[PDB]
């Protein structure tokens, strides 16, 4: 099915403690493949997955050029924001950006993104048509107006339907053995008495890729949305992921509860009972 490429970047101002640090990473799907750290002492875009090292030195020469560039740009943008918002020059502020594209089963273009966030909150972002902009407050409209007289959407739209799609498609062949796998979750159940009246039932899903997964409990076929304890999908390290779901149940009733798993690498959804 589909695939996605994402670059995420964080600039952070540290006044007095020196200069805005700038960190950027790239993903295909849920696998990190490149990075850039403004405080690295290397000042080169670095590899992070094995299948990106096959790219030659002109690649690393290029990408380092684009992402050192953008780093200085946002470093100034941090100043423009502290202007538009009337903030003091002793506080730390964060500038975050993501952009990328999603493609179908054929490698055709599907949807593109180009968004910014100041200090944890939506600032400006490109619409779905990739023609118009969505500013989030007054300061971002000053910037929204600037970026329509400049036809910046035109520019970013050109990158997304072309360069973004082209390069992902390339990486999807370079790493087809890592990136086109789907690993189904191995699943088990655990069980523990809290009191002499109750017990916990924990439904575990280990070692799957990609990250999407659903884990839901039921009692006599009834969704137990509010008594369920459900953790964030977490990374194992090797590039698989983990997730579990937990219910407290009364001692002697563990047979009415069931736990359902859905994943890509599962033909049929699974069901697990204690």
């Amino acid at each position: 099915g589909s695939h996605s490429m994402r670059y995420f970047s964080t600039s952070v101002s540290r006044p007095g403690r020196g200069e805005p640090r700038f960190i950027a990473v790239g993903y295909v799907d849920d696998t990190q493949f490149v990075r850039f750290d403004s405080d690295a002492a290397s000042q080169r875009m670095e590899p992070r997955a094995p299948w990106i090292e096959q790219e030659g030195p002109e690649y690393w020469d290029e990408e380092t050029g684009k992402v050192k560039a953008h780093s200085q740009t946002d470093r100034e943008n941090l100043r423009i924001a502290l202007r538009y918002y009337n903030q003091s020059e002793a506080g730390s502020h964060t500038l975050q950006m993501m952009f990328g594209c999603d493609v179908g089963s054929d490698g055709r273009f599907l949807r593109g993104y180009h968004q910014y966030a100041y200090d944890g909150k939506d600032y400006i972002a490109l619409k779905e048509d990739l023609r118009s902009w969505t500013a989030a407050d007054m300061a971002a409209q000053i910037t929204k107006r600037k970026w329509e007289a400049a036809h910046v959407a035109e520019q970013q739209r050109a990158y997304l339907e072309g360069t973004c799609v082209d390069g992902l498609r390339r990486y999807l062949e370079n790493g087809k053995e890592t990136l086109q796998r789907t690993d189904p979750p191995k699943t088990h159940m655990t069980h523990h008495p809290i009191s002499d009246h109750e017990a916990t039932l924990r439904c575990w899903a280990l070692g799957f890729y990609p990250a999407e997964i659903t884990l839901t409990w039921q009692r006599d076929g009834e969704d137990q949305t509010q008594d369920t304890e459900l953790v964030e999908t977490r990374p194992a390290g090797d590039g698989t992921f983990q997730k579990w779901a937990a219910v407290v149940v009364p001692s002697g009733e563990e047979q009415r509860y069931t736990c359902h798993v859905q994943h890509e690498g599962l033909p049929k959804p699974l069901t697990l009972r204690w």
């Binding site: 670059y7 790239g26 875009m45 990408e63 684009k66 992402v67 560039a69 953008h70 740009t73 946002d74 100034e76 943008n77 423009i80 924001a81 538009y84 952009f99 000053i142 910037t143 600037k146 970026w147 400049a150 910046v152 520019q155 970013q156 990158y159 360069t163 973004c164 082209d166 390069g167």
Partner: peptide, 9 residues
């Protein structure tokens, strides 16, 4: 492949 163009606010 990183982006090509970058704008100021």
């Amino acid at each position: 492949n990183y982006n090509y163009r970058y704008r100021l606010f």
